[PDB]
């Protein structure tokens, strides 16, 4: 059976987490995203000026082209990328997927051209949302799952410290107590779960659904929830230069918790201080609006407080406080 551990590292302020991946012999630093199902990388098919500052995949060296297949994806923050497809060997934490579809970028939007922290994304959402045309392909996880000791992956994302991606096994030393599981609705291709209620400092409210997403930096909630939270933070104000609600870095922030199948997942107020707003003397809040989309995005701010198991059997999500 196979299993493996890949180490992740946050970039400045934990904006994103990158992990090395070897594709056809070349190691690239990718952002693992449980919110999408495409494995795409910077390649030699991009204009030379865009390859700058990145490790790039050269498809002609080792990939097998899928004649006539294309891919095109657009993300929640407005970024997008597109290209062609090859199959190659992909190794993550010593687990190798042979014949994994690799989406070589031909076009990337400005957000990606400006980000030199990563060399592409490795999607970990369900394969049902992979964008390859005319026939969708399976994610790295779906490609290898039958070979793992257990068909699951688990993650521990940390605040300014290296974390891990466990593939095919659960490391019990990464959390306190026992895991609590909840069912996942994968109808929209995400690792979606329900919360029965929430507590924002001194205020509690009714439940809602959300997706566990390693690819989103913050905890994005309904505006009602955001208002309620910030109404308890002295001097909090929206700052479009910063991207949302900001406050004095010294502010004591209330905690935020959700009740999941009887388990209370708590994000301490210290983890809600994201960092310097990068606009004056304030800090940006880890909780911001979801723009009215109807569901919440449990991004890195939330994840930094738990060890999370993504189990294909159910499917289901397991949670426990990080040790």
């Amino acid at each position: 059976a196979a299993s493996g551990v890949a180490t992740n590292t946050p970039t400045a302020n934990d904006e994103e987490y990158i992990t090395p991946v070897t594709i056809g012999g070349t190691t690239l630093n990718l952002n693992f995203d449980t919110g999408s199902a495409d494995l795409w990388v910077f390649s030699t098919e991009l204009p030379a000026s865009q390859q700058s500052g990145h490790s790039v995949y050269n498809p002609s060296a080792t990939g097998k082209e899928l004649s006539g297949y294309t891919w095109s994806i657009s993300y929640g923050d407005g970024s997008s990328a597109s290209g062609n497809v090859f199959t190659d060997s992909v190794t993550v934490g010593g687990v190798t997927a042979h014949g994994q579809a690799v989406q070589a970028a031909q076009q990337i939007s400005a957000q990606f051209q400006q980000d030199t922290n990563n060399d592409g994304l490795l999607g970990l959402a369900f394969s049902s949302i992979n964008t390859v045309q005319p026939q969708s392909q399976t994610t790295f996880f779906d490609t290898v799952k039958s070979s793992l000791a257990q068909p699951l992956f688990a993650v521990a994302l940390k605040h300014q410290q290296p974390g891990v991606y466990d593939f095919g096994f659960i490391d019990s030393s990464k959390y306190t107590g026992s895991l609590t599981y909840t069912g996942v609705d994968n109808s929209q291709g995400f690792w979606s779960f329900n919360v029965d209620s929430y507590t924002a400092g001194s205020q509690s409210g009714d439940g809602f659904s959300g997706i566990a997403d390693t690819g989103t930096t913050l905890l994005l909630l309904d505006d009602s929830v955001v208002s309620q939270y910030y109404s308890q933070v002295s001097g909090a104000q929206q700052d479009s230069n910063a991207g949302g609600y900001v406050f004095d870095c010294s502010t004591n922030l209330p905690d935020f918790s959700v009740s999941i199948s009887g388990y209370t997942a708590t994000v301490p107020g210290s983890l809600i201080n994201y960092g310097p707003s990068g606009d004056g003397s304030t800090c940006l809040g880890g909780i911001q609006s979801n723009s009215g989309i109807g569901f919440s995005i449990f991004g890195d701010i939330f994840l930094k407080s738990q060890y999370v198991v993504f189990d294909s059997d159910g499917p289901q999500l397991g949670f426990a406080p990080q040790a």
Binding site: E15, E16, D77, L121, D213, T216, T217
Partner: peptide, 4 residues
Amino acid sequence: XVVX
């Protein structure tokens, strides 16, 4: 930050 980003929103994948």
